[PDB]
C-alpha cells in the first residue's frame, strides 16, 4: 500500500533508516543486518 | 537529524516495497525480516 520508490529514492530512505538505527546503541548483529540489506539493495538492482 | 520511529518505519516500508518489486529469494527476504525486527525491538528495548 506504501509507494514503490525509484532506486535513488529507496537508497535515500535507507540512509534515513540507518540514521535512525545507529542513533541508538547498536550491537554488531544490527550493524551486520544494516550492511547486508544495503548490499542487497545495490546488488539486486545491479543484477536486475 | 534523526527520524522519529514513525518516519523510520515509513522509510523502511518504502525500502521494502522497492526490494519486493523484484523477484528476490529467501536470503534477501530474510535480510528484510531481520532489519524490520531490529527497527521495532531496538526501539522497544531502548
From Swiss-Prot, chain B:
It is found in: Nucleus; Chromosome, Centromere. Poly-ADP-ribosylated by PARP1. N-terminally methylated by METTL11A/NTM1. Alpha-N-methylation is stimulated in response to extracellular stimuli, including increased cell density and heat shock, and seems to facilitate binding to CENP-B boxes. Chromatin-bound CENP-B is primarily trimethylated. Residues 1-46 are annotated as: Homodimerization. Signal peptide: none annotated. Antiparallel homodimer. Interacts with CENPT. Identified in a centromere complex containing histones H2A, H2B and H4, and at least CENPA, CENPB, CENPC, CENPT, CENPN, HJURP, SUPT16H, SSRP1 and RSF1. Interacts with centromeric heterochromatin in chromosomes and binds to a specific 17 bp subset of alphoid satellite DNA, called the CENP-B box. May organize arrays of centromere satellite DNA into a higher-order structure which then directs centromere formation and kinetochore assembly in mammalian chromosomes. This is Major centromere autoantigen B. The chain holds residues 540 to 585 of 599 of the full protein.
Amino acid at each position: 500500500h506504501m509507494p514503490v520508490p525509484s532506486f535513488g529514492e529507496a537508497m535515500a530512505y535507507f540512509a534515513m533508516v540507518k540514521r535512525y538505527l545507529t542513533s541508538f546503541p547498536i550491537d554488531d548483529r544490527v550493524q551486520s543486518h544494516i550492511l547486508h540489506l544495503e548490499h542487497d539493495l545495490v546488488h539486486v538492482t545491479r543484477k536486475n
